[PDB]
Amino acid sequence: SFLKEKLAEKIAQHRPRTTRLLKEFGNVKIDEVTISQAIGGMRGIKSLVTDISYLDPEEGIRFRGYTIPEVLEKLPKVPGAEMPYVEGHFYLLLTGDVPTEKEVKEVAEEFKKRRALPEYVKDTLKAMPRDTHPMTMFAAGILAMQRESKFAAYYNAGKFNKNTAWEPMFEDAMDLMAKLPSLGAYIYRMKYKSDTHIPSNPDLDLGGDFANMMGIDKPYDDVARLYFILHSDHESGNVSAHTAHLVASALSDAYYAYSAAMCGLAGPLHGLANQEVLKWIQETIDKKLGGKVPTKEELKKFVEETLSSGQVIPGYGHAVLRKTDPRYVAQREFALKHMPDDPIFQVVSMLYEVVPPILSSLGKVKDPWPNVDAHSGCIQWHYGVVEYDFYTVLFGIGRALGVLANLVWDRALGYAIERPKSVTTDMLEKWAGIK
Amino acid sequence: SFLKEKLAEKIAQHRPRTTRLLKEFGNVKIDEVTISQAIGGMRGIKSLVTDISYLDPEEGIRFRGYTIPEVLEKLPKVPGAEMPYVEGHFYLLLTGDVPTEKEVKEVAEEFKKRRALPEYVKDTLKAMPRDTHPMTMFAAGILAMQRESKFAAYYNAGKFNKNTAWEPMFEDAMDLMAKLPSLGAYIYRMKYKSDTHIPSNPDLDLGGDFANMMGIDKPYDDVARLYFILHSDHESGNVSAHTAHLVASALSDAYYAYSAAMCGLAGPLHGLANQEVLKWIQETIDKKLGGKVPTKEELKKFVEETLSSGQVIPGYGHAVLRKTDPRYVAQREFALKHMPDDPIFQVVSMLYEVVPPILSSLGKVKDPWPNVDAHSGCIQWHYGVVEYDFYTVLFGIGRALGVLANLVWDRALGYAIERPKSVTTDMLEKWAGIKAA
Numbered sequence: 001s002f003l004k005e006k007l008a009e010k011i012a013q014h015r016p017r018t019t020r021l022l023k024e025f026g027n028v029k030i031d032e033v034t035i036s037q038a039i040g041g042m043r044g045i046k047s048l049v050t051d052i053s054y055l056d057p058e059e060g061i062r063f064r065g066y067t068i069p070e071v072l073e074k075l076p077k078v079p080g081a082e083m084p085y086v087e088g089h090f091y092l093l094l095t096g097d098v099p100t101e102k103e104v105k106e107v108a109e110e111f112k113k114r115r116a117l118p119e120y121v122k123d124t125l126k127a128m129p130r131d132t133h134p135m136t137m138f139a140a141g142i143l144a145m146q147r148e149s150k151f152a153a154y155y156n157a158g159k160f161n162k163n164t165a166w167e168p169m170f171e172d173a174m175d176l177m178a179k180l181p182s183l184g185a186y187i188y189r190m191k192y193k194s195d196t197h198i199p200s201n202p203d204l205d206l207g208g209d210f211a212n213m214m215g216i217d218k219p220y221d222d223v224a225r226l227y228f229i230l231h232s233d234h235e236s237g238n239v240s241a242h243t244a245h246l247v248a249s250a251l252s253d254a255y256y257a258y259s260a261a262m263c264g265l266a267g268p269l270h271g272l273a274n275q276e277v278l279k280w281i282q283e284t285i286d287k288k289l290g291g292k293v294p295t296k297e298e299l300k301k302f303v304e305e306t307l308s309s310g311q312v313i314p315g316y317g318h319a320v321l322r323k324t325d326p327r328y329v330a331q332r333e334f335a336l337k338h339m340p341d342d343p344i345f346q347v348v349s350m351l352y353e354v355v356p357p358i359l360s361s362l363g364k365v366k367d368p369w370p371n372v373d374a375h376s377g378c379i380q381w382h383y384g385v386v387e388y389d390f391y392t393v394l395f396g397i398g399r400a401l402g403v404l405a406n407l408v409w410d411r412a413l414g415y416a417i418e419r420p421k422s423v424t425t426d427m428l429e430k431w432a433g434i435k
Numbered sequence: 436s437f438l439k440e441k442l443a444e445k446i447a448q449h450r451p452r453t454t455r456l457l458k459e460f461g462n463v464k465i466d467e468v469t470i471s472q473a474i475g476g477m478r479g480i481k482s483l484v485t486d487i488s489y490l491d492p493e494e495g496i497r498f499r500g501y502t503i504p505e506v507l508e509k510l511p512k513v514p515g516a517e518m519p520y521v522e523g524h525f526y527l528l529l530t531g532d533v534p535t536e537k538e539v540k541e542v543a544e545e546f547k548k549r550r551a552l553p554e555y556v557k558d559t560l561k562a563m564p565r566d567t568h569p570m571t572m573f574a575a576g577i578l579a580m581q582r583e584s585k586f587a588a589y590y591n592a593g594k595f596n597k598n599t600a601w602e603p604m605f606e607d608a609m610d611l612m613a614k615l616p617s618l619g620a621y622i623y624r625m626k627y628k629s630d631t632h633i634p635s636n637p638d639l640d641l642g643g644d645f646a647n648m649m650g651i652d653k654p655y656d657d658v659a660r661l662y663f664i665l666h667s668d669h670e671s672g673n674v675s676a677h678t679a680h681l682v683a684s685a686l687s688d689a690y691y692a693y694s695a696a697m698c699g700l701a702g703p704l705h706g707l708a709n710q711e712v713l714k715w716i717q718e719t720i721d722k723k724l725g726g727k728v729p730t731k732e733e734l735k736k737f738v739e740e741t742l743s744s745g746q747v748i749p750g751y752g753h754a755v756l757r758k759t760d761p762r763y764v765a766q767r768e769f770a771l772k773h774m775p776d777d778p779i780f781q782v783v784s785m786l787y788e789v790v791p792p793i794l795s796s797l798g799k800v801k802d803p804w805p806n807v808d809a810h811s812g813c814i815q816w817h818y819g820v821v822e823y824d825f826y827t828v829l830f831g832i833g834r835a836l837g838v839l840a841n842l843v844w845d846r847a848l849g850y851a852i853e854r855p856k857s858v859t860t861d862m863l864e865k866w867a868g869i870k871a872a
Contacts, residue, residue, distance in 0.1 A: 017860055018474065025867035026471035030858065033468065036461035038484050039453065041684055041851040047468050047477045048857040055857065120564050127562035128579055129555050136581045139694070143578065144563055146571045155703055235857035239685045242855070243678060243695060249476055250674045250702025259574070260678060260695035267685025268590055269852045319854045416476040417704045419754045420677070422483040422490065422670035423465070425452055432460035 002106055004170060006095050011166065011412040014051075018413050035428050043319065048245070049415070050236035052093050052406045060326040061234055063089075063402075064096045068326045071229065076104045078205050081218075083225035086206040086401065087111055089232055090177060093405035094170075108205050114178035115200060115209070117186060121145060125190060134187050134390050135271070139262040141183045146255035148175065155251065166412035172254040173404035180397045181206055184390075185213035192387045210397075219338060220383045224394075226334055227379075230327045230372060231395050233402020237320070240265040240396075244403045245410060249418040254407050261403060262396050271395055275388035277315035278377030281347050293346045300354045307362060313355050315374025318367045324356075331375035344378040437541055439605060441530050446601060446847040449486075453848050470863050478754065483680070484850070485671035487528050487841045495761040496669055498524075498837075499531045503761045506664065511536045513640050516653075518660035521641040521836065522546055524667055525612060528840035529605075543640050549613035550635060550644070552621060553580060560625065569622050570706070573828050574697040576618045581690035583610065590686060601847035607689040608839035615832045616641055620648035627822045645832075654773060655818045659829075661769055662814075665762040665807060666830050668837020672755070675700040675831075679838045680845060684853040689842055696838060697831050706830055710823035712750035713812030716782050728781045735789045742797060748790055750809025753802045759791075766810035779813040 031046040053063045063071055075084035075098060087107040091099040099107070124144045125137050146152065150168040154160065182200065189197050193215060201212050207225035214220070236245050244261035248254065265271040285291060288302055303313065318325070332352070335345045352370060359368035380391060466481040488498045498506055510519035510533060523539040526532070534542070559579045560572050581587065585603040589595065617635065624632050628650060636647050642660035649655070671680050679696040683689065700706040720726060723737055738748065753760070767787070770780045787805060794803035815826060864870040 014860070017864070020869075021470050021860070021863050021867055022474060025863075025869075026469060028470045028867050029467050030470060030473060030863070030866050031468040032464050033466040033480065033482055034461060035456050035463045035465055038465060038482055039457060039850065041853040042482045042855040043851065045468065045480075045482060045855045046858050047473055047480060047482065047855045049473050049860065049863065050857045051859050051861075054859050054862075120562065123562040124559060124575075127555065127558040129582055132579070132582050133587075136578060136691075139691075140559075140575055140578050143571060143575050143694075143698070144567070147564055147567050152568075160703075237855045237857045239681060239852065239854065242853070243681055246674060246678055246681065247695070247699040247702065250699050250705035252698055252702035252705075256571075256574075256698035256701050259578075260682070260698035263578070263687055263691035263695035264682040264685055266691055267682065267687035268595075270685040270687075319852070320856065415474065416478065417674060417754065418476040418677070419674065420477040420480045420482045420672045421755065422485050422672045423481050424486050424489050425449070425456070425484065426486075427489075428456050428460075428465070428484065429452070431465050432456060432463050434455075434460075 001110065002103065003091060003094065003110070004167075006097070007166075007170065007408070010095055015413065035432060038423065038428070047420075048236045048242065050245075050406055051096075051409065052402050053233035053235050055235045055237075055320050057320055057322040060321060060323065063233060064092055066092075068230065068330050072226075072330065074098045076101050078208065078221075078225070081208070081222050081225070083207065083222040084229065086225055086228050089229045090401050090405065093232065093402055094408065110174060111178040111206055112202055114175050115182055115206075117179055117182045118145060118148070120147075121183065122186060125187065130191065133266070134191060134387075135262060135266040135392050135396070137187045137191075138183065138393050138396055139259045139266070141187070142176070142180070142255055142262065143259035145176070145179070146253060146259075149253035149255050150175075151253040160251075162414045165414075166408050169254060169411040170408045173408050176254055176258060177400055177404050178206075180400050181210040182213060184393045184397050185210060187393060188214055188387070188390055192390065214385075216383055216385070223334070223379060223383055226330065227376065227394060228398035228401065230330055231398030233399070233406070236406055239267060239270045240399055241403050241406065244407060246418045248407045248410055249415060254404055257407060258400060258403065261399070265392060265396055265399065271392035273315055273371070273373030274376045274380075274391045274395070277373050278344070278381060279388065280314050281344055281351075281378070285343065285347060293343050294350070296350060296354060299347070299350050300358070303351075303355055303358050307358065313351070313359065316355055316359060316368070316370055317365045318371050321367050321369070321371060323367075324369045325371040327372035328370045328375050331372060331379060335375070335379055339379070339382045342378065342382050344381060348375060348378050436545065437538060438526060438529065438545070439602075441532070442601075442605065442843070445530055450848060470867060473858065473863070482855075483671045483677065485680075485841055486531075486844065487837050488668040488670050490670040490672075490755050492755055492757040495756060495758065498668060499527055501527075501533075503665065503765050507661075507765065509533045510664075511539045513643060513656075513660070516643070516657050516660070518642065518657040519664065521660055521663045524664045525836050525840065528668065528837055529843065545609060546613040546641055547637055549610050550617055550641075552614055552617045553583070556580060556618065557621060560622065565626065568701070569626055569822075569825050570697060570701040570827050570831070572622045572626075573618065573831055574694045574701070576622070577611070577615075577690055577697065578694035580611070580614070581688060581694070584688035584690050585610075586688040595686075597849045600849075601843050604689060604846045605843045608843050611689055611693060612835055612839050613641070615835050616645040617648060619828045619832050620645060622828060623649055623822070623825055627825065649820075651818055651820070658769070658814060658818060661765065662811065662829055663833035663836065665765055666833030668834070668841070671841055674702065674705045675834055676838050676841065679842060681853045683842045683845055684850060689839060692842060693835060693838060696834070700827060700831055700834065706827035708750055708806070708808030709811045709815075709826045709830070712809055713779070713816060714823065715749050716779055716813070720778065720782060728778050729785070731785055731789060734782070734785050735793070738786075738790055738793050742793065748786075748794065751790060751794060751803070751805055752800045753806050756802050756804070756806060758802075759804045760806040762807035763805045763810050766807060766814060770810070770814055774814070774817045777813065777817050779816060783810060783813050
């Protein structure tokens with residue numbers, strides 16, 4: 001494929017840079033580690049390398065150098081629709097290049113060929129109790145398809161070569177990425193839509209076919225394209241991306257690695273904030289504002305009561321972001337266009353205005369600004385995706401774009417097994433000078 | 436339970452120490468990060484904290500302060516058998532204390548109550564194609580049981596409290612640990628023993644019942660007890676333990692976390708060395724030594740040919756160990772006792788003698804010494820566990836002892852979400868002085 005050959009070129013150009021940094025500049029110091037950071041989840045330690053995306057604390061995420069407005073502007077659009085082909089964003093994350101129309105169509109055609117779900121995946125999800133959480137089903141579906149791993153068969157056949165290993169990793173990434181939306185849709189239908197299924201439309205792109213198979217009309221196709229692109233990557237240090245990277249570093253294939261990643265994304269501190277924001281807004285509308293859209297005044301003081309009574313505003317704050325999330329901003333622009341009169345959006349909008357000034361005053365949250373999770377839920381809810389637990393599956397579909405691109409590159413550049421060193425509490429006490 | 440109350444005491448004593456390190460000494464520097472280390476998988480960076488076990492590069496692994504000879508010596512033994520109750524090792528990893536016989540029996544009784552496998556786990560493994568790799572089945576079985584998570588139900592009911600969160604995590608750890616051997620055995624029977632099943636014996640301990648359900652006679656019960664204890668933990672920085680820790684740090688339950696861990700352990704650079712050693716020895720016996728146990732002389736030069744022709748001796752070397760693995764030594768002592776005349780063991784033994792001197796000369800492997808994976812396979816093979824792919828499942832059963840103990844403590848001590856920062860190649864080039872024009 002043109003995509004694979006393009007990627008081979010980019011790998012040939014990049015490898016010497018990595019070789020040189022190790023050969024000449026291996027010992028250059030880039031950060032330090034404190035007791036606080038070792039105890040506190042490696043917080044802020046610059047210990048990972050990725051080029052897929054980079055999270056700037058001030059500017060937010062850049063994908064392959066580009067801002068979100070730039071990505072949405074430059075990527076080829078689906079005919080008849082507002083948003084880019086998700087396939088085109090995948091091309092960008094893999095290669096660093098904005099694809100031409102011709103180049104995106106080739107990826108879209110390849111995804112059409114690879115998007116069918118193995119029957120045994122459906123068998124497996126049916127054998128799992130139907131009351132199983134959708135993220136458990138999602139991770140299990142990915143894991144079961146490890147049977148098809150080209151990377152694993154390559155390794156098991158004795159063919160491993162450090163120069164060529166990215167190639168079967170790429171094939172697995174294409175196979176998995178093409179299928180994840182269908183897997184998600186299957187779970188949505190089987191759990192929440194009476195277990196009736198809408199067949200894949202082989203003429204639709206990834207995002208369009210996802211909306212089709214979910215059973216949701218235009219413009220949910222664009223909602224999904226946007227959602228997936230925004231959630232595509234957030235560098236490699238987030239729990240889900242890091243988990244994939246870590247697992248793959250032991251030369252586990254992408255099915256093992258991405259299944260593991262979804263186990264991390266399932267975590268309340270990683271994949272739940274969207275639904276927790278939305279629930280909190282819906283409860284606020286109902287209990288604190290008598291079921292009605294409030295004034296800027298009424299909400300301004302509602303916020304202060306929640307804060308001064310010792311509780312968080314959900315969807316505000318972040319481990320790394322220190323300014324407004326540009327992913328949040330893109331969601332906002334979509335909502336302003338398509339659902340300006342939606343009651344829940346109106347509260348989201350007003351929260352944007354009133355909450356940052358207030359959080360800044362108290363000066364206690366290092367990021368007194370919204371992240372995407374403040375915005376995503378009102379859009380999903382508007383279009384009738386009311387099934388909160390499933391929101392994380394949407395995230396998992398999206399995040400695979402960047403993570404699978406990252407795994408291809410980890411193998412391209414021969415990144416070594418991730419294996420830091422542990423220390424005991426005694427050892428920390430020794431270093432601290434405690435007796 | 437006495438175990439849970441003992442653990443509660445240990446947590447009460449430990450928490451203030453963690454609080455003090457953060458309050459008073461948070462900014463004390465303990466290490467740095469270089470370009471080499473960021474590119475090279477955080478190699479050597481002291482960025483994780485665990486008390487379950489500590490890997491010394493020279494002395495090897497210590498479990499709660501104790502060496503392997505000490506653990507095997509002090510832990511109560513199963514009556515009529517040579518090796519400790521695995522349950523007693525779990526007590527040690529959880530509490531830091533060597534249990535009395537009374538204390539181990541209480542854990543053994545609790546494991547008996549928790550060991551039955553949900554039928555839907557069997558349903559799920561049957562729906563998965565039978566030609567699925569056993570580690571994929573193993574991870575899937577763990578994952579499916581996420582449905583039963585007490586930690587997840589606790590969280591979902593709005594009950595999360597940073598002081599009490601360890602408690603449902605402990606319950607899940609006990610539930611999962613009790614079941615993992617049965618899950619493993621199920622997979623073994625369904626894939627490799629014609630899909631006939633030997634029922635759990637409710638009077639056997641964890642290791643004994645595992646051998647029972649596998650269909651393997653004494654002394655495989657002791658093989659398993661020893662195997663599981665040796666593989667129990669290797670601090671938190673190994674890929675499988677770290678994966679569990681990382682996933683759980685986002686407050687994912689133990690089923691999500693340990694399933695994720697087995698995805699990592701399945702990796703060729705993590706969970707395959709046992710079977711790769713054994714295959715390489717069996718191929719060596721057959722092709723390079725005409726199906727016969729060689730002389731120290733013949734093997735000494737066979738090694739040099741493999742090395743100087745640009746290939747590794749499997750089961751030698753390590754990311755962190757710089758001396759002989761004491762886990763290897765314990766395996767050796769078992770083999771000397773129980774199978775001194777086994778052809779494959781004899782080659783393993785002779786490799787112990789001849790390979791370190793040679794690897795030291797060439798001075799190219801930072802650890803010119805064996806790890807466990809050099810020894811485990813000849814023991815499994817001797818007792819008729821010929822199914823190479825399954826060896827990693829044995830590892831996964833064992834490693835849960837330390838990893839699940841570690842997750843309970845991560846929650847006890849409120850360890851925060853693991854979230855390091857990424858950098859680009861451009862940024863490394865800037866720091867190196869190649870860029871900034």
